[PDB]
């Protein structure tokens, strides 16, 4: 399927144990997509002081359209030293590995895969 319904655990930035997906734009997008498929991906909501506490390159989920079955359609955009790879809508949050942190909420998304 071109899209997959996912429910992403929303993590507090200070709980996150693995603060990024890797060392290059291509690796982080690769790893983000693998963790999304494997159900091992968390979401951190972006506010003042969040991104400097995580590791670049960043992987964002961004709104790709204006929401089937409660799931916002999203796509992945990476960022490294202020340059984004991808073009999409509003940021819903930054993706990180999930390694058993307790979430505060779930974010229902329809991921363009």
Swiss-Prot record:
- Functional note: Inhibits host translation by associating with the open head conformation of the 40S subunit. The C-terminus binds to and obstructs ribosomal mRNA entry tunnel. Thereby inhibits antiviral response triggered by innate immunity or interferons. The nsp1-40S ribosome complex further induces an endonucleolytic cleavage near the 5'UTR of host mRNAs, targeting them for degradation. This inhibits the integrated stress response (ISR) in the infected cell by preventing EIF2S1/eIF2-alpha phosphorylation upstream of stress granule formation and depletes host G3BP1.
**Superkingdom to which the source organism belongs:** Viruses
Taking every annotated instance into account, which residue ranges of this chain make up the domain CoV Nsp1 globular?
2-113
* Full-protein interval shown: 11 to 125 of 7096
Q: What is this protein called?
A: Host translation inhibitor nsp1
**Region named Disordered:** 1-113
Q: Tell me what gene encodes this.
A: rep
Where would you find this protein in the cell? Host cytoplasm
